[PDB]
Write an enzyme that holds these catalytic residues in place. Sequence first.
Site, PDB file in Angstrom:
ATOM      1  CD  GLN A  51      -1.070   0.774   3.638  1.00  0.00           C
ATOM      2  OE1 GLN A  51      -2.179   1.219   3.347  1.00  0.00           O
ATOM      3  NE2 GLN A  51      -0.574   0.846   4.863  1.00  0.00           N
ATOM      4  CG  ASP A  69       7.325   4.397   4.797  1.00  0.00           C
ATOM      5  OD1 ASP A  69       7.434   3.772   5.868  1.00  0.00           O
ATOM      6  OD2 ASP A  69       6.203   4.774   4.343  1.00  0.00           O
ATOM      7  CG  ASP A  71       3.470   2.889   3.909  1.00  0.00           C
ATOM      8  OD1 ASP A  71       3.693   3.019   5.152  1.00  0.00           O
ATOM      9  OD2 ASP A  71       3.808   3.737   3.060  1.00  0.00           O
ATOM     10  CG  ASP A 121       5.277   1.986   8.272  1.00  0.00           C
ATOM     11  OD1 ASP A 121       4.866   1.408   9.287  1.00  0.00           O
ATOM     12  OD2 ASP A 121       5.151   3.225   8.073  1.00  0.00           O
ATOM     13  NE  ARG A 188       0.250  10.119  13.342  1.00  0.00           N
ATOM     14  CZ  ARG A 188       0.746  11.178  12.702  1.00  0.00           C
ATOM     15  NH1 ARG A 188       1.639  11.958  13.316  1.00  0.00           N
ATOM     16  NH2 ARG A 188       0.360  11.452  11.462  1.00  0.00           N
ATOM     17  NE  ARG A 298      -2.221  12.638  13.941  1.00  0.00           N
ATOM     18  CZ  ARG A 298      -1.905  12.624  15.237  1.00  0.00           C
ATOM     19  NH1 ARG A 298      -1.098  13.581  15.742  1.00  0.00           N
ATOM     20  NH2 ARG A 298      -2.407  11.685  16.042  1.00  0.00           N
TER      21      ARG A 298
HETATM   22  N1  LIG Z   1      -3.718  12.069   6.906  1.00  0.00           N
HETATM   23  C1  LIG Z   1      -3.978  10.921   6.200  1.00  0.00           C
HETATM   24  N2  LIG Z   1      -5.190  10.747   5.606  1.00  0.00           N
HETATM   25  C2  LIG Z   1      -5.505   9.636   4.920  1.00  0.00           C
HETATM   26  N3  LIG Z   1      -4.635   8.616   4.768  1.00  0.00           N
HETATM   27  C3  LIG Z   1      -3.400   8.677   5.322  1.00  0.00           C
HETATM   28  C4  LIG Z   1      -2.990   9.839   6.091  1.00  0.00           C
HETATM   29  N4  LIG Z   1      -1.711   9.598   6.527  1.00  0.00           N
HETATM   30  C5  LIG Z   1      -1.344   8.380   6.041  1.00  0.00           C
HETATM   31  N5  LIG Z   1      -2.376   7.835   5.346  1.00  0.00           N
HETATM   32  C6  LIG Z   1      -2.408   6.541   4.653  1.00  0.00           C
HETATM   33  O1  LIG Z   1      -1.321   5.759   5.132  1.00  0.00           O
HETATM   34  C7  LIG Z   1      -0.386   5.484   4.078  1.00  0.00           C
HETATM   35  C8  LIG Z   1       1.032   5.372   4.640  1.00  0.00           C
HETATM   36  O2  LIG Z   1       1.377   6.654   5.197  1.00  0.00           O
HETATM   37  P1  LIG Z   1       2.795   7.345   4.925  1.00  0.00           P
HETATM   38  O3  LIG Z   1       3.002   8.425   5.950  1.00  0.00           O
HETATM   39  O4  LIG Z   1       3.830   6.277   4.704  1.00  0.00           O
HETATM   40  O5  LIG Z   1       2.520   8.108   3.545  1.00  0.00           O
HETATM   41  P2  LIG Z   1       2.915   7.764   2.016  1.00  0.00           P
HETATM   42  O6  LIG Z   1       1.730   8.161   1.225  1.00  0.00           O
HETATM   43  O7  LIG Z   1       3.415   6.349   1.912  1.00  0.00           O
HETATM   44  O8  LIG Z   1       4.084   8.822   1.738  1.00  0.00           O
HETATM   45  P3  LIG Z   1       5.681   8.531   1.905  1.00  0.00           P
HETATM   46  O9  LIG Z   1       6.208   8.269   0.506  1.00  0.00           O
HETATM   47  O10 LIG Z   1       6.163   9.859   2.473  1.00  0.00           O
HETATM   48  O11 LIG Z   1       5.800   7.371   2.859  1.00  0.00           O
HETATM   49  C9  LIG Z   1      -0.602   6.661   3.124  1.00  0.00           C
HETATM   50  O12 LIG Z   1      -0.110   6.442   1.795  1.00  0.00           O
HETATM   51  C10 LIG Z   1      -2.111   6.805   3.189  1.00  0.00           C
HETATM   52  O13 LIG Z   1      -2.718   5.744   2.434  1.00  0.00           O
HETATM   53  N1  LIG Z   2       0.159   3.329   7.852  1.00  0.00           N
HETATM   54  C1  LIG Z   2      -1.127   3.520   7.469  1.00  0.00           C
HETATM   55  N2  LIG Z   2      -1.774   2.628   6.698  1.00  0.00           N
HETATM   56  C2  LIG Z   2      -3.047   2.843   6.327  1.00  0.00           C
HETATM   57  N3  LIG Z   2      -3.760   3.928   6.708  1.00  0.00           N
HETATM   58  C3  LIG Z   2      -3.213   4.898   7.467  1.00  0.00           C
HETATM   59  C4  LIG Z   2      -1.833   4.746   7.886  1.00  0.00           C
HETATM   60  N4  LIG Z   2      -1.527   5.827   8.644  1.00  0.00           N
HETATM   61  C5  LIG Z   2      -2.630   6.631   8.698  1.00  0.00           C
HETATM   62  N5  LIG Z   2      -3.635   6.055   7.988  1.00  0.00           N
HETATM   63  C6  LIG Z   2      -4.973   6.651   7.761  1.00  0.00           C
HETATM   64  O1  LIG Z   2      -4.859   8.032   8.055  1.00  0.00           O
HETATM   65  C7  LIG Z   2      -5.778   8.389   9.088  1.00  0.00           C
HETATM   66  C8  LIG Z   2      -5.173   9.499   9.985  1.00  0.00           C
HETATM   67  O2  LIG Z   2      -4.010   8.934  10.625  1.00  0.00           O
HETATM   68  P1  LIG Z   2      -2.971   9.783  11.527  1.00  0.00           P
HETATM   69  O3  LIG Z   2      -2.692  11.078  10.795  1.00  0.00           O
HETATM   70  O4  LIG Z   2      -1.744   8.964  11.787  1.00  0.00           O
HETATM   71  O5  LIG Z   2      -3.778  10.209  12.849  1.00  0.00           O
HETATM   72  P2  LIG Z   2      -4.772   9.401  13.847  1.00  0.00           P
HETATM   73  O6  LIG Z   2      -4.529   7.935  13.656  1.00  0.00           O
HETATM   74  O7  LIG Z   2      -4.358   9.987  15.208  1.00  0.00           O
HETATM   75  O8  LIG Z   2      -6.152   9.871  13.391  1.00  0.00           O
HETATM   76  C9  LIG Z   2      -6.000   7.078   9.818  1.00  0.00           C
HETATM   77  O9  LIG Z   2      -7.260   7.104  10.492  1.00  0.00           O
HETATM   78  C10 LIG Z   2      -6.000   6.068   8.698  1.00  0.00           C
HETATM   79  O10 LIG Z   2      -7.204   6.186   7.918  1.00  0.00           O
HETATM   80 MG   LIG Z   3       4.791   4.668   6.321  1.00  0.00          MG
HETATM   81 MG   LIG Z   4       4.840   5.591   3.086  1.00  0.00          MG
END
Ligand SMILES: Nc1ncnc2c1ncn2[C@@H]1O[C@H](COP(=O)(O)OP(=O)(O)OP(=O)(O)O)[C@@H](O)[C@H]1O
Ligand SMILES: Nc1ncnc2c1ncn2[C@@H]1O[C@H](COP(=O)(O)OP(=O)(O)O)[C@@H](O)[C@H]1O
Ligand SMILES: [Mg+2]
Ligand SMILES: [Mg+2]
Length: 346
Positions: A51, A69, A71, A121, A188, A298
């Site tokens: 993902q 990273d 996921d 991750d 989180r 956030r």
């Molecule tokens: N604020 C958010 N709202 C919705 N989904 C989120 C949010 N933060 C993370 N996610 C979900 O979790 C996944 C993993 O988060 P992560 O912080 O690794 O971001 P990323 O999109 O993989 O970017 P990066 O390349 O910086 O890792 C995201 O791709 C997204 O699907």
């Molecule tokens: N690693 C992840 N994999 C899948 N979905 C994620 C991931 N991190 C965050 N999300 C999505 O992003 C939303 C917001 O996450 P985050 O910003 O970490 O704050 P919180 O969990 O405190 O609401 C989560 O409710 C979830 O839908």
């Molecule tokens: Mg990640």
């Molecule tokens: Mg990522």
Amino acid sequence: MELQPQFNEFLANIRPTDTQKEDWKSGARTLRERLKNFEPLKEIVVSTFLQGSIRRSTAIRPLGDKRPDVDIVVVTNLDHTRMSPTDAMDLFIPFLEKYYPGKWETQGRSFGITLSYVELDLVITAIPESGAEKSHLEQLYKSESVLTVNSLEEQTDWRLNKSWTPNTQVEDAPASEWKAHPLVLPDREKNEWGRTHPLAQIRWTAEKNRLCNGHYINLVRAVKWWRQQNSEDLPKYPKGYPLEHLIGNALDNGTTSMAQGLVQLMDTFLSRWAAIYNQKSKPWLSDHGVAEHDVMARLTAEDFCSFYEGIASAAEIARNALASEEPQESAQLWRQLFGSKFPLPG
Ligand SMILES: Nc1ncnc2c1ncn2[C@@H]1O[C@H](COP(=O)(O)OP(=O)(O)OP(=O)(O)O)[C@@H](O)[C@H]1O
Ligand SMILES: Nc1ncnc2c1ncn2[C@@H]1O[C@H](COP(=O)(O)OP(=O)(O)O)[C@@H](O)[C@H]1O
Ligand SMILES: [Mg+2]
Ligand SMILES: [Mg+2]
Ligand SMILES: [Mg+2]
């Protein structure tokens, strides 16, 4: 000038490397197989799938020797009303100690696994549905559509449909089968289940990319690269997925080139959020996976407004770069945004 060949070269320069790519594909396949054959978890794990930005082809190459990273979602059939997020996570510790000794660690709501060239991750999730609805979703999570470890740009024929098969035709499944069905994952910072719908985000991104003639995921990576190259003059947030979400929001359907798309999305960002910026506030933006979630929850108003100022400065440069009728001058302006990974024309 649009300089489409130079944009293509730039994109090749900022994608994760082939070494990284093969490492995370091998890593995901091996993790999935080990989980599938691990007797204590055999009847609990529904699916292990790639993902995040890696899956969506919106990841950029880390600077230096940093590991990307990567996921991963583990889908379980655990009852989230009877077990907490940490109950679910606790089940995976023997598995991690058996197969990844010295290379894993708990990282709050997820597990980190260090491979040779990448960092996995892993988030542990559960299906809130029951009965026949649950069985139908499990069939989707077990399908090639979900289990492919190729990214979106490697498989433009990909659709979210349990009948999709790799092109070694079909469309996304009707929305009624998946749209209102998020997974739950750990919040989180606290031991409570929150909703997440990564399949819906992936599908939305693939479709946006189609609607934008293949330029969307490239524009996400280009803007992420701009943010990194200009990080001293930009706020720390947004970055990562909220940044990607702002870009997907700002970009219109129908994009015909990278250069046109950059100018359009920046212009639209500035006009769309002008009032919010004047109010010293920030937008509330519905997540494409979980509608009632604010992707910007956030993000502070101060950071959003500093970011708006950064886009406003960038847009002047991008407009000039597009308007320039001379290849070298145009490329030098684009390099003002992106740095030297954007090549000069021959
Ligand atoms: N604020 C958010 N709202 C919705 N989904 C989120 C949010 N933060 C993370 N996610 C979900 O979790 C996944 C993993 O988060 P992560 O912080 O690794 O971001 P990323 O999109 O993989 O970017 P990066 O390349 O910086 O890792 C995201 O791709 C997204 O699907
Ligand atoms: N690693 C992840 N994999 C899948 N979905 C994620 C991931 N991190 C965050 N999300 C999505 O992003 C939303 C917001 O996450 P985050 O910003 O970490 O704050 P919180 O969990 O405190 O609401 C989560 O409710 C979830 O839908
Ligand atoms: Mg990640
Ligand atoms: Mg990522
Ligand atoms: Mg839009």
